[PDB]
Design a protein around this ligand. Structure first.
Ligand SMILES: [Ca+2]
Length: 421
């Protein structure tokens, strides 16, 4: 199967809403037609000019952003070809062959007080992609777990951004390919994060760091809350565009898809859901470990992502250290404080500088320790280029394919797990 086949099937799928079928058809036909060109971005500034053209009538929603990404010709053929074969890509595998962990048992229960796992150990461990270059904390490199966002596999997501964190920090990346691309129940998705934390810490005999994107923040926060043993081994939680309070919708429709029939994780990411309320209760709205949140006003998925009520904000009632980093505040009226989408924060220079600063100091990332004139003056971190910007934007095409192919669709959020009340 391919991105083209999934979207062509969705275009001919009677269960899907008229507008989404048209977008799927347009995208499937635009990919096969495009498979460099005159319309392609010749530079990084040209890529941003195309993004700013999409934002000309205001911040779009998920469906408008995804449709316009191809209309403006932001994704070149070579990147489209790579994104098209994401399902068969080894980096996105949920069937990785990892050895049994040594030392104290981490399954079924690492420590009293941890929530029971509903997922089998073999399935949890197989979701972890450990690169052959991983040093198991024997080389002075801190293991960093890359947690994916909604409808997008980790492997492809981080290939174009933080998969390269080791080039900027003393970080040894691993990524978690959550089955069904994080579209199932967030409570189930979180188990993969909780297990990955305790597993990577065990094999490395070291504390770890977690870097998450989008829903990845919710998966990590839930794992930290309900598996307290994970809190002791996580030194830094770097959250890119996190929706710790979910997101609002103008109409009575789900986040992302904006329909009546969606997926469990789409429905759970609503502002006033039982999921969000359950997570935020008992201090779940405060950090569990040093947390560095990084978010943008121009987030087309999550709102509000500015002001005092921003979804990304965590309080610090436990006194573990928290920094809530709003791009348009820290880099106000500067290139790094520009039009950075929900996915765009993954290639933001301030996001990278904060991630590096967080990993090199006790506590979270601190903008006061950075040379903000240099950092805010950039459009991309020195570690990333044009293809990284374009590829990260191209993820929306995979996110749409995964959302549309998800079956059976649901009209509401699932029941709250017994351990959470
Ligand atoms: Ca730190």
């Amino acid at each position: 199967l391919s991105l083209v086949s999934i979207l062509s099937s969705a275009a001919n799928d009677s269960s899907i809403e008229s507008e989404a079928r048209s977008i799927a058809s347009l995208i499937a036909s635009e990919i096969v037609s495009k498979i460099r060109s005159t319309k392609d971005a010749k530079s990084v500034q040209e890529a941003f000019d195309k993004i700013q053209s999409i934002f000309a009538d205001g911040t779009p929603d998920f469906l408008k952003m995804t449709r316009e990404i191809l209309t403006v010709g932001l994704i070149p053929a070579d990147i489209l070809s790579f994104l098209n074969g994401y399902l068969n890509l080894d980096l996105n595998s949920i069937h990785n062959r990892n050895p049994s962990p040594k030392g104290q048992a981490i399954y079924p229960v690492k420590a009293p007080g941890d929530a029971r796992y509903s997922v089998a150990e073999n399935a949890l461990r197989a979701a972890i992609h450990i690169p052959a270059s991983f040093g198991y904390g024997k080389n002075g490199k801190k293991p960093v777990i890359l947690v994916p966002g909604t409808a997008t596999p980790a492997g492809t997501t981080y290939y174009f951004n933080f998969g390269k964190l080791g080039s900027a920090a003393d970080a040894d990346v691993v990524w978690l390919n959550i089955p069904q691309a994080s579209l199932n129940d967030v409570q189930i998705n979180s188990e993969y994060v909780a297990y990955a934390i305790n597993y990577i810490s065990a094999i490395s005999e070291s504390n770890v760091a977690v870097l998450s994107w989008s829903q990845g923040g919710l998966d990590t926060q839930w794992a930290l809350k309900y598996w307290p043993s994970t809190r002791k081994v996580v030194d830094d939680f770097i959250a890119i565009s996190p929706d710790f309070h979910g997101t609002v919708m103008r109409s009575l429709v789900c986040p992302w898809l904006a329909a009546l029939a969606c997926t469990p994780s789409l429905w759970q990411q609503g502002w006033n859901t039982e999921f969000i309320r359950t997570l935020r209760g008992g201090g779940g709205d405060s950090a569990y470990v040093p947390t560095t949140t990084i978010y943008s006003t121009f987030d087309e998925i999550v709102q509000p992502m500015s002001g005092s009520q921003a979804s990304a904000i965590l309080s610090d009632s436990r006194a573990v250290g928290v920094s809530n980093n709003h791009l348009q505040t820290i880099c106000g009226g500067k290139p790094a404080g520009g039009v950075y989408t929900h996915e765009g924060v993954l290639y933001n220079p301030l996001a990278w500088a904060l991630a590096v600063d967080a990993l090199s100091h006790d506590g979270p990332g601190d903008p006061s320790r950075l040379d903000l004139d240099v950092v805010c003056g950039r459009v991309l971190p020195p570690q990333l280029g044009l293809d990284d910007l374009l590829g990260t934007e191209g993820l929306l095409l995979i996110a749409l394919a995964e959302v549309l192919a998800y079956k059976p669709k649901t009209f509401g959020e699932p029941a709250i797990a017994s351990y959470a009340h």
